[PDB]
Write a structure and sequence with these properties.
The structure is cut from a larger assembly and holds two copies of chain A (418 residues).
Chain A: H1 2-20, H2 27-41, E1 52-56, E2 63-66, E3 70-74, H3 77-80, H4 84-99, H5 102-107, H6 111-123, H7 134-150, H8 157-166, H9 178-181, H10 186-198, H11 208-220, H12 230-236, H13 241-257, H14 261-274, H15 279-291, H16 295-303, H17 312-325, H18 328-341, H19 346-358, H20 362-375, H21 379-390, H22 398-416
Parallel strand pairs in A: 1-3
Antiparallel strand pairs in A: 2-3
Helix pairs in contact in A: 1-6, 2-4, 4-7, 4-8, 7-10, 8-10, 11-13, 12-13, 13-14, 14-15, 15-16, 15-17, 16-17, 17-18, 17-19, 18-19, 19-20, 20-21, 21-22
The structure holds zinc ion (2 copies).
C-alpha cells in the first residue's frame, strides 16, 4: 500500500526529526501552527493522509514537506511574516506539494536514508538539498492560492510574500535557503501576482493568536536573526490593539527570561484582567508563579479555567503546577489520561515520567520515558527502558505482558527500516 | 620585553589609582587576589605576577593589561550568583594575558603608551575603548574554562554567565559594557556551551568568603545599581547556611553603617561567637567597637587572634584601633613593619601618616603621605612632600639623604614615561 508506506515512511522521518533537529515543542506554539495548518488542509482538495505541522528553531527561512502530510516550518517564518495570511500562504504552498505528491512522484526516478539525511540538513542550523521543478512550484502556487482563499486569508499575501523574498535575493549576498528548495524566478512571481489580481479583493486581519505566536517564537525561542527586537515591539505599541497586547506579552516574556519575575508579573496583569480565560497569558501566569515558588496560586487559577477539559495547553500547565507544588499524584491523574489522548506528545510523557518518579513507581517511570525515546527514534533505547521495567514486575502479570508487548511493537517499527 | 611590560604595567596601575575609584578595603582586596591567584596557580604559561583590582563601578566590565594586572568592576558581584561565575570572568581575563592578546595587538601599530592609558582610565571610571577580535574571545573562553575547572569551579558557570549577560542585553535597552569590550555573538555562546558540555558535571558550593565579599561589596561600597537590597538578604536568609550567615553579616554591616552599633553587635554576636577567629567578623567587630569609642575592647579582641602576625587585615585593623585608642606609637610600630613588607599598599602608608601626625613627627608624616601620592601616580606632589620633609631635617643627616634619595628615585621614574 502506497498510502500505508508513505504514512510510516513519514513517521520514520518525523521520529528522526525529533531525535536530532531542534524542534519547538511548546504547547501554545505547536497547537497554533497545527490549528492554522489544519484549517488550510480542511479546505484542500484530495487530502488522503493526516497532516502535522512542525516548527524548527532555525533563523534561516525555509519550508518543506514529505510523505504522510508532514510539513516542516522554520521559526524564521515568523520573522518574515508581517501578517497571518503570508504565513498561511507558505503553509498553503507546502500543503499543495503534498496533495500533488510532488516529492513522492519525484522519487520514483540506502535511498530511504539518503533522503532522510537531506531532510535534517535542511532543518538543522547545520546545512544535499531537495529542489522542486518550477512547474511543480507553479502548481503549488496555483493550488495554494485557492486553498488560501477558501480558508479566508488574503490572496494578495502570497505575491506580497514572494516579492519580499526577492528583495532579499539581490539586496543581500545570501540567497535565503527557502529560495533554493523553492526557486523564485520572476515568471513565478508575475504568475502569482496575476492570479491574486483576478480573485476577489479581501482585506483580512491577522488573528490575535498570530501576533502572540510571533511574539513567543521570537521572544522565548530567540536564536540568531530570530530576535524580538525593541524596534518591532515599539512598532507594535503603535499598531492595532492586537499588536499592543502582543507587544506587552513579549516584554513580560523577556522580563521573565531575565528572571525579573515581579517586573514580568506586573506587565502581564492588565492583559490577564481583560482576558482571564485564554491560554496564552494563563501559560505565562503559571510560568512566573512557579519562578517564585508560588505553585498553589498557579494551581488555583488553572482549576478555575473554563476549557481545562478541552485545551491541552491548560492540561499540561496544571500537571506541571501540581509537580512543582509537591502533589505528583494529582499530576499523574491528569497525565495518565493526557498521554492516552495524545500518544505522540512527548511533553506529556516526560511529565508523566516526572510524576511517576516522584511517586517511586519506577517501572511506570521507565515506561513513560520509554515513550519519549520511541518518539525520538531511539527505539533501541526505548526497548532497553521497557526491558528494565519488565524486570521489576512479576512474570505473568499484565504489567509484564504490557511492557513486553510494547517492546514487540517497537521491534516491528525497527525491522521495517533496516 | 617582559621587563618593559611589567614596568609599563606599574605605570598604568599608578594612573588607575590616581583617577579611578578603586576599592582598597583590606578584606575585599585580599579575597579577590586570593581567588585570582588560585586561578593563576592552575593556569599555563604564566610568565608574570598577578594583581587584581576592584573598581567601585556599577557598570559590569573587566579588562587586563601588561604585568598581569586584571581590573574588575564591582558590578561583577551583582551579576555573579555563584563563586564560579565570578571566577569564570577572572579566568577569561587571565587567559587574555597569558595569550598576550593586548601585547600582540599593540605590536602591530608600532605618545602611543599614553593613548592606551587614557582608554584604560575611561573604561574604569564610571563617567575610545579597547575591544578584542572574535579569535581572542574564543581563545580566552576555551583556555579560561580549562583553568576554571582545574581550580575546582563549575565549568558550566561560564556559559551560564555569558547567557545571563545576553538575557539582560535584550531585556534592557542597555547593553552591558562588558559585552562591548568582550563581544558575545551567538557563535561564541554556542562554543562556550560546547566546551562546557564536553567536561563532566561538577556541583561546587561557593566559599563562604564569596557571599561575605558579595555582602561587603554591595553593602559597604553600595553605589547606583550596586545595592545590598532587602530582596537579596531575604533570599539569602532562605538559602544554605553560608548565605544565611552572610545575610546576618550584611545586616550587621548595614546597622553599623547607620550607626546602630548596639543593634549591629547583637547581629554579629552569633557569627563571632561561632568562629572568633574569622577575619570578616573580627573586622566588623572592630568597626562597631570604635564607633562607640571602645578602643580598648577592640584592641584586646584583635591581640587574641592567631593570624595577627600573618593576616594583613588584622594588622591594619589593630593599627587603626591603636590610633583611636590614643596609642599612636604602638600603631607606628605595626605600620613601620607593614609598609616595609607591603610597599605598594596605600592603606599602610596612610595610617602611618596618621600615626606620625599623632606623634608630631612632621617630616616622617610628610614622607608617608608622599608614598601615598607616589602610589597614585602623583609624582610631582610626592616630590613636593619629600622636599618639605628634607627641609625640616639637618643637612648631612641620615634622614636628609634618604628623603633626597627617594626624590631621586621618583624623578627617575618620571622621565621613563613621557
Ligand atoms: Zn515550493
Ligand atoms: Zn574577552
Amino acid at each position: 500500500g502506497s498510502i500505508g508506506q508513505e504514512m510510516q515512511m513519514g513517521d520514520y522521518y518525523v521520529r528522526q526529526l525529533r531525535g536530532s533537529a531542534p524542534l519547538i515543542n511548546d504547547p501554545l506554539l505547536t497547537q497554533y501552527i497545527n490549528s492554522l495548518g489544519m484549517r488550510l488542509v480542511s479546505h484542500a482538495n484530495s487530502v488522503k493522509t493526516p497532516f502535522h505541522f512542525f516548527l524548527i528553531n532555525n533563523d534561516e527561512i525555509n519550508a518543506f514537506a514529505f510523505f504522510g502530510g508532514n510539513v516542516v516550518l522554520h521559526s524564521a517564518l515568523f520573522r518574515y511574516s508581517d501578517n497571518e495570511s503570508q504565513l498561511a500562504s507558505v503553509m498553503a504552498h507546502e500543503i499543495s506539494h503534498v496533495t500533488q505528491r510532488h516529492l513522492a512522484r519525484a522519487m520514483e526516478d540506502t535511498w530511504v536514508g539518503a533522503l532522510g539525511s537531506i531532510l535534517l540538513a535542511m532543518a538543522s542550523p547545520q546545512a544535499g538539498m531537495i529542489s522542486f521543478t518550477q512547474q511543480n512550484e507553479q502548481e503549488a502556487d496555483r493550488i495554494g492560492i485557492q486553498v488560501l482563499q477558501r480558508s479566508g486569508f488574503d490572496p494578495q499575501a502570497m505575491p506580497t510574500f514572494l516579492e519580499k523574498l526577492l528583495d532579499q535575493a539581490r539586496y543581500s549576498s545570501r540567497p535565503p535557503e527557502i529560495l533554493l528548495t523553492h526557486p523564485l524566478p520572476e515568471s513565478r512571481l508575475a504568475d502569482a501576482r496575476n492570479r491574486a489580481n483576478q480573485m476577489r479583493p479581501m482585506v483580512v486581519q491577522s488573528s490575535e493568536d498570530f501576533y502572540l505566536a510571533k511574539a513567543r517564537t521570537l521572544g522565548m525561542y530567540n536564536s540568531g536573526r530570530n530576535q524580538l527586537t525593541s524596534d518591532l515591539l515599539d512598532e507594535w505599541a503603535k499598531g492595532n490593539v492586537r499588536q499592543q497586547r502582543a507587544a506587552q506579552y513579549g516584554r513580560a516574556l523577556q522580563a521573565m527570561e531575565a528572571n525579573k519575575y515581579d517586573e514580568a508579573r506586573k506587565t502581564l496583569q492588565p492583559l490577564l484582567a481583560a482576558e482571564p480565560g485564554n491560554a496564552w497569558y494563563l501559560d505565562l501566569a503559571t510560568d512566573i508563579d512557579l519562578g517564585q515558588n508560588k505553585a498553589n496560586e498557579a494551581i488555583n487559577r488553572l482549576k478555575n479555567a473554563r476549557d481545562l477539559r478541552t485545551n491541552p495547553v491548560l492540561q499540561l500547565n496544571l500537571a506541571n503546577a501540581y509537580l512543582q507544588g509537591g502533589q505528583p499524584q494529582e499530576a499523574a491523574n491528569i497525565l495518565n489520561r493526557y498521554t492516552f489522548n495524545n500518544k505522540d506528545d512527548s511533553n506529556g510523557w516526560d511529565l508523566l515520567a516526572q510524576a511517576e518518579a516522584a511517586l517511586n513507581n519506577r517501572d511506570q517511570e521507565l515506561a513513560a520515558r520509554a515513550e519519549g525515546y520511541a518518539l525520538a527514534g531511539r527505539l533501541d533505547q526505548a526497548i532497553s527502558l521497557l526491558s528494565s521495567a519488565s524486570s521489576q514486575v512479576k512474570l505473568g502479570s499484565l504489567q509484564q505482558a504490557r511492557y513486553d508487548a510494547r517492546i514487540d511493537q517497537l521491534r516491528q517499527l525497527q525491522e521495517r527500516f533496516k
